Structure 1
Amino acid sequence: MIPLQHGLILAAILFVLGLTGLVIRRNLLFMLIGLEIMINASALAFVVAGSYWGQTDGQVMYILAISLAAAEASIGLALLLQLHRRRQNLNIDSVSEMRG
């Protein structure tokens, strides 16, 4: 009896909140956290869409989504550790060596 539109609205709210955290935060760690929030919100939207139609496609796409999310979190944290090792800071605005 739960509407599909309300679940999609919740997913959209979480997605724009994660994107706002990705934009306004100068830390690379909080940028990765906001990215995690966005991909989790997309997976939530897929689960709601799959459960509305009564199919396993939403859960399968969620499984692929969280596989990608885990791999991307690993990749971003490895890059963050490399940045903190070789520059001793996580300022994403200071790493702007090439431009124009």
Structure 2
Amino acid sequence: MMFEHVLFLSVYLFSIGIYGLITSRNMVRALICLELILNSINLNLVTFSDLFDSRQLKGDIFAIFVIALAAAEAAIGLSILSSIHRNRKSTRINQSNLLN
């Protein structure tokens, strides 16, 4: 059930990754769930590049690039978090709607 049971867990993570995103209240939790979604897509990707495409790996390289960009985004978002917590002394996300 290798090729079949893992994909059955991709969605069962991806979905959760979205839900925690929407119902998130603090910035760090939203970023965590974002990273979780990216890892879900990564996992949905890799298995495809193990059943087939073994002559020239086309998924593992793409997985590497996805992880690199995930790290970059997780750096930039937290950097923005620093400045927002500097401006206002609380990072409650859903209590800032002064741009509407």
Task: After the TM superposition, list the runs of 4 or more consecutive aligned residues in structure 1 that deviate by more than 6 angstroms.
Answer: none
TM-score, normalized by length of structure 1?
A: 0.90
Which ranges in structure 1 are unaligned for 5 or more consecutive residues?
none
CA displacement at 1:17 relative to structure 2: 1.1
Structural mapping, 1:1-100, within 5 Å: 2=2, 4-55=3-54, 56-99=57-100
What are the Cα deviations for residues 1-36 of structure 1, in whole angstroms up to 9, with x where unaligned?
61x232112111111111111111111110000000
TM-score, normalized by length of structure 2?
A: 0.90
Q: Percent identity?
A: 36
Paired residues, number: 98
My pick for the range that moved more, 59-68 or 4-13, is 4-13
Structure 1 distance, partners of 2:4, 2:96, is 41
Counterpart AA for 1:88: K
Q: Is the partner of 1:72 in helix, strand or coil? A: helix
Aligned-pair RMSD on alpha carbons?
A: 1.3
CA displacement at 1:94 relative to structure 2: 1.8
Which ranges in structure 2 are unaligned for 5 or more consecutive residues?
none
